[PDB]
Amino acid sequence: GAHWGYSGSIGPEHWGDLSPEYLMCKIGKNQSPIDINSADAVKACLAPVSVYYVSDAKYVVNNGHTIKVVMGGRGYVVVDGKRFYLKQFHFHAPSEHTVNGKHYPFEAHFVHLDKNGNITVLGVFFKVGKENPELEKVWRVMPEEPGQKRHLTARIDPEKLLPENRDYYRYSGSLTTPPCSEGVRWIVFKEPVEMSREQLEKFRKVMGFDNNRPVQPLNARKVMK
Amino acid sequence: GAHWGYSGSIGPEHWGDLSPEYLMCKIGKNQSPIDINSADAVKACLAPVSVYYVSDAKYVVNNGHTIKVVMGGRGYVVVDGKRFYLKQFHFHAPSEHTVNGKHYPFEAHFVHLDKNGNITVLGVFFKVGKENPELEKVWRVMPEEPGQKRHLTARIDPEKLLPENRDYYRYSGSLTTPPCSEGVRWIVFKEPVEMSREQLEKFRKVMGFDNNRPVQPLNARKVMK
Amino acid sequence: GAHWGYSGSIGPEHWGDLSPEYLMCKIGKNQSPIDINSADAVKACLAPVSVYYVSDAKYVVNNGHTIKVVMGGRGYVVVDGKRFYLKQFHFHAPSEHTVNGKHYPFEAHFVHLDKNGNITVLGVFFKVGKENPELEKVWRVMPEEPGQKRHLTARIDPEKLLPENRDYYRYSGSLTTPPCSEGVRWIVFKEPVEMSREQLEKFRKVMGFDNNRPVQPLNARKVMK
Amino acid sequence: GAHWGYSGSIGPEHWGDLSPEYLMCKIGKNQSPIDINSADAVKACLAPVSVYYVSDAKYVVNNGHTIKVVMGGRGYVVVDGKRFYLKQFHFHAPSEHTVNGKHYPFEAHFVHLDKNGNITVLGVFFKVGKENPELEKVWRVMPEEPGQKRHLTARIDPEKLLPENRDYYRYSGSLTTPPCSEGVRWIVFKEPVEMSREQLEKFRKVMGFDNNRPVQPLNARKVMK
Ligand SMILES: [Cl-]
Ligand SMILES: [Cl-]
Ligand SMILES: [Cl-]
Ligand SMILES: [Cl-]
Ligand SMILES: [Zn+2]
Ligand SMILES: [Zn+2]
Ligand SMILES: [Zn+2]
Ligand SMILES: [Zn+2]
C-alpha cells in the first residue's frame, strides 16, 4: 500500500485519501475504535468467548506503527461457534477504545483469522499498577528501531495477558489501521489488566508518538454488554 | 443515478457496477436485508420503540420498483432517544428479510430520517389472512403504471399498519435498494400483520416481478432480539 | 396429610385449612400456578435446560386427581448445573398456568427430584390440533377409577411430548396440589404442542371435572423469559 | 414476638425456635442475606429503580440491634410500577450481603412499604475511604443506649447515601432480622460508597459486636443482575 502514520498529511483523518486500498477509512459507517458509554451499550446474552492459545510465537517486530508479536496461528478463540486463529498481537498507547469518554493508558489487540479469513480482534485495556510478568518477556527484547525483528527466547503465553474476568463488550467494526476493513468482530474485555509505570514508559518512549486512531461515530450500531 | 432493477444485467448482484454512487452495494460488509435465525440472534434489553405518527400523506406513487406512499415528514418514531421522522413507506413481495431461512409473502418498510439525515427503517412482515382495512385505503387507488402518482382521498393512519405486539429484532444494516447506504438502523417487528389473498395478488400483479433484494451475509453482526 | 378435591369445602380455595401440613397453601407467598404476562415477566439470559429422558415408565395410574405415568427415576433434566431425575408426569385440563390471562385446553407436568430431594417441574401446554402419537400410547390404556393402576403396552418416550423449541419461562414456585410445597423450580415451555379434540375429550370425560388450581399472586417474584 | 441477638442462644442460628412467629426463619426457603456470585446470578433486563426521597427524618435511635433513622414516610421508590415509601433506614457492620463470598466493611438498608403493606429494601455497600458527609450528619448525633432516641440537628438527604451508579442486583427475599418475614423485594446496588475508617470505627465501637446475619441458602431462586 502507501505510507501512513498518526500525524500530519498522513494522519488518521487523511488515511482514506492515501491509497485506493484505504477507501473504507473514509466511506465506512462501521469503523473502529469507538467510545463505549451508557447511551450506546445494551445488556445482551453474550456467549462466553473461550480461549485456547498455544506458545507459538515467532518473533517481535517494531514496524514503525506498533510493537507486534507474530504468532504461528495454531492457537484460537471460539466466537460464534467457530475457531478464530491467533495470528499476532500488538499494542497502542493511549488506548484506542474509550469508556465513558475516557482513555486507558494502553490497549493490546489480539488479531485472529478464521478458516475463511474473517477477523476477530480481542481488546484488553491496561492500567498502571503492578509489573506485568508476561509483558516483560516481550518488553525485555523490544526492538528499538522501526524495521527491526527480534527472536523471542522466553515462551510466550498470550492467555496470561487477558483479564481473569472474561466479561466483554461486543460490536461490529473495523481494523483500526489502514485499510480499515469492515466486518470485524470486536471483543473488548471490561476488566483492565495492570502494567508497571516503567513498562508503559518504555513502550511510549520507543514509539515516540501516540499510536491510537481517534474514536469513530457509532452510527447505527449498539455496543453489547 | 443509473437505471437498476431486479433481473438481468441490472439485477441486485450487479448493482455495485452500475453507478459510482452504488459502490456500497458490493463493498459493504453491513448490508441488508438478512436472514434472522437462532445462530445469529441474541437476547438483548432493547428499548421500546415508541410511535407518534400523523396523517400527513401526500400521495402514492408507482416508481417501477415498488408502490410507495410519500408522507409529509411530521410524524416520528423514537429510537436511541431521538426523533426519526416518517418520510415514506413502501412495499416488497416476497419479503426481503427472512426468518429461519423462510420468506413472508410481503414486507412493508417505513423509512425515517432524523434531524441530521440518519436513517431508521421499521420493517413489518405480512401473512395472508384477513383483509387489511388500512392497506385498502392505499390499494384502492394504487397506480397501475410506473411513473404514475395518485392523490389519496382517505386519511392515512400508518400506525394501524404496525403489529399490536411491538417486540422487534434490531441490527445495523443498509438501504436495500441503490445506493445501499450503510449506517441504517433496522427495527424489524417479530409479529406479522395480515392482508388478504386479494390484496397480495393485486400488488404482485401490478409489479409483475419479485422486488426483493437477496439476503446478505451477516458478517460480524449480531441480530438483537 | 388429609384430603382434597376441586369443588366445595375440598376445592382449591379451602385446601389451606384442611391440615397443619397444608399450611403454605395460605401463608405461602410463592405459589403456583401463575399468570405469565408482560407486567410480571423480565427478559433474562436463561441457560438451556437439557433433557435426558429414558423409557423407564412403570405404570399409568388414575388417582382421582389426574392421569399419571410413574417413571423409574433414571432419566433427568439439567437445571442450575444439577441433575433432577424424572419421577412422574401427569395432566391438567384446562391448563393451570395462563399466558396473558388465557388458558390452554390442556397442560402436562413433568416432576423431577435431585439427589437432595429438591423439586423441578417442567410444564408443557397443549392446543387442539393433530392427534398426539406419544400421548396416544398412554391414552389407549388410560385407567378410570381412583386407585386403579394399569400397565403400558408401548414404549414411553416422554421427551417426545415436549415442544421442539425449548425456550421457557422460569420462576421460584410451588406444587399445584397439597401440601403445595414451595422451593419448586418451574420451567414452563413457551411453545405448545398439539393433541386431538378426541384426545382432549377423553381426558375431560375420564376426569369428569376441571382439575386446574386457579392462578396465584406473584408477590415479590419476577417471571424470567 | 419474643427476644433476639447476635451471639449464643439468642444469636442468628437460634432465632427460628424462639417464637411461633419466628417460624419462617427455619421453614423459609427465601431468606436474606445471600451471597451474590457468578453461579446464582443471571443477566436480566431490570427496570431502573427511581428514587424520590424527601427530608422527613423524625429521629435517630439506638435500639440495641442497629443505629436507625426513622423517617416520616413521605419519600418513596418506584418498583414494578408501584410506590414504596421510605419508613426507615439503618446500618450493619460488616456487610450482611456478600459478593463472591467477600464482605464489605459496612452495609446500609433502606426500608420501604407500599400502600398495601408490601416491603422493599434497598441495600448499599460501603468501603473504607474518604469521610462520608451525609453519614456524618447522623454520626455526630449517634445515640448509645438500647432504647435511646436523639434529634437530628441537620437536614437528612438519604438519596445522597446512594451510589451515583444505580445498577442493582434483585431477588425475592426476607427481612434479615426476626420475624424474618418473606416476600421482601431486595434491590442491592452494585457500586459501593465511601466512608472514613473513623466513621466505621465509631459504629463498630458503639455497636460493640458484629450485627450481620450469616448468608442464607439460595434454593430455587436466581439473583437478577
Ligand atoms: Cl453471542
Ligand atoms: Cl436499545
Ligand atoms: Cl439461568
Ligand atoms: Cl424489572
Ligand atoms: Zn491495534
Ligand atoms: Zn424497502
Ligand atoms: Zn400438575
Ligand atoms: Zn438491615
Query: Number of structural domains, chain C?
Result: 1
Find out whether B149 and B143 touch, Cβ atoms under 8 Å. Answer: yes
| Cβ contact, residue pair D45, A45, below 8 Å | no
CA-to-CA dists, residue B112 to B77, B78, C73, C163, D77, angstroms: 8, 10, 58, 39, 37
Find out whether C60 and C150 touch, Cβ atoms under 8 Å. Answer: yes
Chain A CA closest to residue D38: A165
Beta carbons within 8 Å of A112's beta carbon, 6+ residues apart: A76, A77, A79, A84, A85, A86, A87, A119, A120, A121, A122
Q: Separation of A49 CA from ligand 4 center, angstroms?
A: 27
Coil, strand or helix: which one is B20?
A: helix
From chain A, which residues contact B within 8 Å (Cβ)?
Answer: 23-24, 27-30, 39, 42-46, 80-81, 118, 170, 172-173, 181-186, 219-222, 224
Nearest to D224 among C39, C173, C222 (CB): C222
Nearest to B221 among A27, A28, A172 (CB): A172
Alpha carbons C128 and C94: distance in angstroms, whole number: 12
| Cβ contact, residue pair C219, D172, below 8 Å | yes
Q: Extract the C-alpha cell encoding C141.
A: 390404556
Coil, strand or helix: which one is C197?
A: helix
Other Cβ atoms closer than 10 A to A84: 25
Which positions in chain D touch C30 (Cβ < 8 Å)? 29-30, 172, 182
Give C43→chain B minimum CA distance, Å.
7
- Give the number of B-C residue pairs with CB atoms closer than 8 Å: 4
Alpha carbons B16 and B12: distance in angstroms, whole number: 8
Coil, strand or helix: which one is B180?
A: coil
C119-152 burial: b if 16+ Cβ within 10 Å, else e: bbbbbbbbebeeebebbebbbeeebeeeeeeeeb
Enclosing domain of residue B41: 1-225
Alpha carbons D34 and D28: distance in angstroms, whole number: 14
Find out whether D42 and D222 touch, Cβ atoms under 8 Å. Answer: yes
If 0-12 CB within 10 Å is exposed, 13-18 middle and 19+ buried, where does residue B51 land?
A: middle
Report cis status (omega within 30 of 0) of the bond before A179.
Answer: yes
Chain A CA closest to residue B217: A183
Nearest to D30 among C30, C42, C80 (CB): C30
Quick one: DSSP state of residue B214?
P
Provide the edge-to-edge strand list for the sheet that holds D35-36.
D35-36, D98-99, D102-103
HSE-CB of B204 using CA atoms within 13 angstroms: 14
- Give the number of A-D residue pairs with CB atoms closer than 8 Å: 4
A92 is in an annotated binding site: yes
Nearest to A172 among B118, B170, B220 (CB): B220
Choosing from C14, C65, C103, C112, the catalytic residue is: C65
A96 is in an annotated binding site: yes
Alpha carbons B120 and B56: distance in angstroms, whole number: 19
Terminal-to-terminal C-alpha distance of chain C: 35
Chain B CA closest to residue C42: B45
**3-state SS track over A143-156:** CCCCCCEECCCCCC
Beta carbons within 8 Å of D40's beta carbon, 6+ residues apart: D34, D218, D221, D222, D223
Which positions in chain C touch B45 (Cβ < 8 Å)? 43
Residue written as grid cell 389519496 = B152
Ligand nearest to the CA of B45: 2
Q: Separation of D133 CA from ligand 8 center, angstroms?
A: 21
- Report how this structure was experimentally obtained: X-ray
Which positions in chain D touch A45 (Cβ < 8 Å)? 43
A151 is in an annotated binding site: no
Terminal-to-terminal C-alpha distance of chain D: 35
Alpha carbons D49 and D71: distance in angstroms, whole number: 20
| Cβ contact, residue pair D220, C39, below 8 Å | no
Find out whether A117 and A175 touch, Cβ atoms under 8 Å. Answer: no
| Cβ contact, residue pair D182, C224, below 8 Å | no
Numbers of helices and strands, H then E, in chain B: 3, 16
- Give the distance between the most distant pair of CA atoms in chain D: 46
Establish whether D151 is a catalytic residue.
Answer: no
Angle in degrees, CA B45, A78, A22, rounded to 5: 85
Other Cβ atoms closer than 10 A to D198: 11
Find out whether A5 and A178 touch, Cβ atoms under 8 Å. Answer: no
From chain A, which residues contact D within 8 Å (Cβ)?
Answer: 43, 45
Q: Which CATH number belongs to the domain containing residue C98 in this structure? A: 3.10.200.10
| Cβ contact, residue pair B45, C45, below 8 Å | no
Alpha carbons B120 and B118: distance in angstroms, whole number: 7
